[PDB]
Design a binder for this molecule. Structure first.
Ligand code: QVR
Ligand code: QVR
Ligand code: QVR
Ligand code: QVR
Lengths: 363, 10, 344, 363, 344, 10, 10, 10
């Protein structure tokens, strides 16, 4: 029927667009000041890229991005949204008296029909770890409406990988799974399921934030150029990595974040979800290693992170990594659609052994 | 997933 | 097609049984000591309702209720579970050397085929506010395998409701919707969606615990007797109420909790989720009025809480409340499947 | 040298009498209102048993009991105390102007020399579970100074046993020992010691309080009559028990408490540390079962609790118990000198499944 | 007889090593994440002080520090432990397949016989207030096995002290002693022991944590360098101080904490128990004055904290403090071995 | 709904 | 043992 | 002393 129906189980779509039908979710997204702030600047400050232009807003939700484009002088704006948020955004279009410049089209971008080609596509298709939700494919799919020389806002995406040490996080997994390791839970021996409990917990990417000093080597960046990439490029994403360790210790996994750049004619605006930057609602994503890997400063940690698209609008994660000086290796399989939200609001504590001067001296 | 976009505290 | 697949659209059942497939969710239920310890007490205290009996465990999960029934001396126990948790229950049956007594049967109880009729049914079919998940219908549906003289554990469920006052909770939700009151959010006028935002936020029941001092009237009780009720009885649940106000103040909604009773041959044991009792993973449930009603100590607050079952394994809640002495009326629609979990 | 030196390692004595040398420990004991209140009543209300009598106060500490005897009219009081609390009590004797009626004798009762025989001995030799500290032997040893027909205050002691169900308490043991069940605690596999961790925790009697409804059968009482018992009777204490279960469930151990009676000529006063009575600083003592025992109402739980005196002024506990209808048995070995103080101040919560009427109905 | 058995009376060593024989106490130390994670960081970051080196672990307990040294590439590690914990360290060596590298040697380091000299010593010899247990002397005593160029991990320990103000803590302890002020406790006059009670309660250092806002002056520092200090140096520790008061108020005593530094060949890593840093099982230590001293912002509080070692593997503490501007003096005797653990 | 049984702290 | 008599809260 | 290392909550 449509490209979206082929690659997405109906049940996943239902749950998915039902989520985005709630104004409370839009609200949560709009109240991300970094997110909404950066998108606004990237649009109004590149006003020549919108002034009198034709615009496509893919997955517009409430239409906020389509108003920024209007605020930038766009002539006509086709705002596509599949969730039932489309009708709320039409209301906002009427109430803001923009029915002549912003056209809401209820429906999935892979199925709707636009009356013309656009000069620029705008969207917010980034999920956590960038690739979750598989909306980037819808963003690249939308290029069937983009004229030659048209632009994409965002234009590129940089996903960053880095190995981290966090013993507390790792040990937490066994502390929770060890619930099942008792011979008499109300007179039942649960121990036979302890191993399955561990496995289940390690399959979950961890969504929270952390102090930069848990990282043991500079980041490796894999870049998707939205102006050149095609849908099929994202069904299988292989991210080779060769980290040079700057800190000795136990590598418990790889940390993920991403950035996007709105490369306009006037300036390039960056939206970065890095642990060095103020927190956004994307947080950061860490993938643990079933078995951790000892590494010393000067060793090389090498391997691959392979993401395989599934019919649940997410990715199956496979991470293989070894310390080249020892041959010690570690594998892991995680489901990006079932993360464990760990954030607690507390500022991330610094890893131990990080004071190189007496804390008492300058207290 | 269940919550594609995570809640960010205001 | 089966009784289940008709009243449930696939997309709800997928996400539903996916959730119970995870051991972390079994750990959370099982670690509820009041919940798990009370079932065990109820079953062992009434061991003679199990001793050498045939048992049906509806939605056995990891099988913990089947182990209690075995501990009580049951001759055979068919443990039915439709999530992938059934494979884990098998593993525990083998490792606890009860393969001769507990027979895990994967699938939906509306669809599986039991080998024989049972003397007693056991299950934990209670959702928050009791009726969420629509699993009570699966519980009642299972009575087709029940012998004439057979029993049900739990035997009855008493859902309680009482008006409450909580300005802190009302303003919290109210101000959230007022985000959409802004006339110039990043230059954008959002005010036209104010009414839609308020309807949405107040469509959500609030799940958390509360001090009883906020209840303004004795609770009204509606009892579902699992021995006598049939499936269709629970498609539309009409609960008339008439509260005698004991305190003046703003009525901000109705608070809900429930009890269940295991009416055995030796003693009756209660599992209660009341706000006066230790907390359970069910908490309590409060349905807010978009506009509270003012009542005086001595007035009568009367109305009807109507629960209409839907294809999402939950209920559309309708609460109409009226202060008789002034004619102040409040009509509300809530979606039990989309609660707001407020506890911290 | 002396009976006390033979049965007590010096190191145990040192630590032991150093503890009782602190006024903060006396204070803690004296501020036990039940304890001090009951001892006062038992003495002044049996005034004929003290009026113009000769008294021996064994382990007098601060001398409080010796003042009650003075308040009752005793002619002369020999107050024996081994700890350095003896000198504080002499001060109290001088400051209270009782040097003519109360004589402090620093030293262990097994080694001091009294100038005469006494008509009545008073003491507080009860440890937790009654028998800890092995001071009862010193109390019976002191009868070498008691005339024929003399009295003992306290006169008897009743230790009570009852089986209890407390799944939370039992499971706590494995939750704590499961710390060691992780393959990579900072890169170390600790699991080989998990079993030793469990064992260590089960060897500890639990000192706290509990709700009476955790008990599954009426108590069994073993009585020591201090007027007839001899020292050697307490080196080996065998407590047979045959409990008739009144509640079905998992038996996780046996609960202990005790009572003492001051059988005076005028009245009999009881000091009871039972879970039905206001809390004293003795609390109650529970001994867990390594493996719990399924029992239904109407079954009989039978076995023995055997206490073997050791050279650390305490007892080695051995508990064997079986359900006679099934043959299911359980053993356990605990060290009474190394309890786990569990009390938290919170009122003991009632066991689940104890509501026979709807909590909502009468709320 | 050995260096240990002379400076330690048996009754103290029995109870002392009995305590460390229990796994529950190892669990408590090891679960101190700041403590255990900081040692591991210090050792792995400076792996070249271990790579193919010979190591001595003084009081290895369960052996966790020896495993870190093995993780850092140590050629051989003699792990010395005098409690019964040594048998459990052996078990972990076997189960972690490090029997070729870690050699558990049970006994007191003052008594055992090592087969050879070591390049580096590792240990956790720090008690609360640093000096309790007198284990630093065992650490320094072990240097007889240390090569000329050998290193010590930790290399130095900085004990800090600063005057504090805490009326809530002073009155708490003061009123406790006032129990013995009663003239008629059950008719008995206890007042004659009032002075003895106060001396006893204030002889106890208070172990717990405190907000730094209560410190009235910059901390004074006394450094023990483990590479250069010898055993006897720690028998009598004299710490002169002269505090410049930054705030007016009642000085209720001196607060103590400590840092240690692992001075490796690659980097220096600090383990600090300061009140500004995350809490550790060492907490901080406060010695109260029986009578506080009043000082004005700008006065000088001078005196001497003297620590005399005793046979109970601890120290007799003497703190004399004097407000120079008024001659207000306070003399105090405290027993480090008998602290009051106040944290909750 | 999304999460039929709510997380209960232990 | 270490504390023959247990502390009772006042 | 009685307890050289103090209990630390986790
Ligand atoms: C992360 C933001 C998602 C927004 O875009 C909408 N959306 C997702 N996928 C599609 C497709 N295929 N077509 C149109 N709109 C889409 C989400 O509903 C949300 O508003
Ligand atoms: C609240 C607990 C629910 C448990 O029962 C299982 N369950 C729900 N609905 C069914 C049906 N129709 N058949 C079998 N098992 C069922 C849930 O999977 C959960 O374990
Ligand atoms: C439980 C109370 C003990 C008090 O009695 C003293 N004490 C114990 N053991 C002896 C012996 N053998 N002789 C004299 N006093 C003793 C304790 O010191 C405490 O005050
Ligand atoms: C604070 C940690 C002490 C650990 O070291 C052990 N230990 C103390 N003192 C000695 C001596 N002299 N020799 C060997 N091991 C010692 C303690 O047992 C504890 O594990």
């Amino acid at each position: 029927r449509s490209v979206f129906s082929e690659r997405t189980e109906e049940s996943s779509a239902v749950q998915y667009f039902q989520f985005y039908g709630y104004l409370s979710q839009q609200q949560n997204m709009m109240q991300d000041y970094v997110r909404t702030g950066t998108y606004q600047r990237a649009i109004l400050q590149n006003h020549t890229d919108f002034k009198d232009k034709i615009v496509l807003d893919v997955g517009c939700g409430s239409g906020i991005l389509s108003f920024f484009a209007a605020q930038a002088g766009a002539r006509k704006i086709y705002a596509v949204e599949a969730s039932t948020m489309a009708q709320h955004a039409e209301v906002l279009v009427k109430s803001n008296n923009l029915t002549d410049r912003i056209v809401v089209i209820p429906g999935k971008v892979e199925e709707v029909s636009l009356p013309e080609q656009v000069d620029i596509i705008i969207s917010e298709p980034m999920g956590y770890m960038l690739f979750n939700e598989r909306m980037l494919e819808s963003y690249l799919h939308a290029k069937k409406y983009l004229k030659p020389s048209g632009n994409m806002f965002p234009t590129i995406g940089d996903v960053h990988l880095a190995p981290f040490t966090d013993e507390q996080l790792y040990m937490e997994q066994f502390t929770k799974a060890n619930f099942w390791y008792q011979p008499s839970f109300h007179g039942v021996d649960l121990s036979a399921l302890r191993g399955a409990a561990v496995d289940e917990y390690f399959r979950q990417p961890v969504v929270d934030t952390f102090d930069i000093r848990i990282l043991m080597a500079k980041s490796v960046k894999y870049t998707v150029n939205f102006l050149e990439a095609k849908e099929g490029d994202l069904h299988r994403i292989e991210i080779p990595f060769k980290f040079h360790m700057l800190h000795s210790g136990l590598v418990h996994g790889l940390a993920f974040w991403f950035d996007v750049a709105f490369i306009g004619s006037i300036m390039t605006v960056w939206l970065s979800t890095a642990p060095t930057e103020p927190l956004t609602h994307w947080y950061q994503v860490r993938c643990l290693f079933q078995s951790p890997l000892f590494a010393k400063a000067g060793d090389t940690l090498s391997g691959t992170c392979l993401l395989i698209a599934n019919k649940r609008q997410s990715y199956d994660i496979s991470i293989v990594a070894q310390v080249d000086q020892t041959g010690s290796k570690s594998s892991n399989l995680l489901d990006l659609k079932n993360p464990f939200f760990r954030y607690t609001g507390t500022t991330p504590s610094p890893p131990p052994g990080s004071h190189y001067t007496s804390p008492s001296e300058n207290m | 997933g269940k919550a594609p976009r995570k809640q960010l505290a205001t």
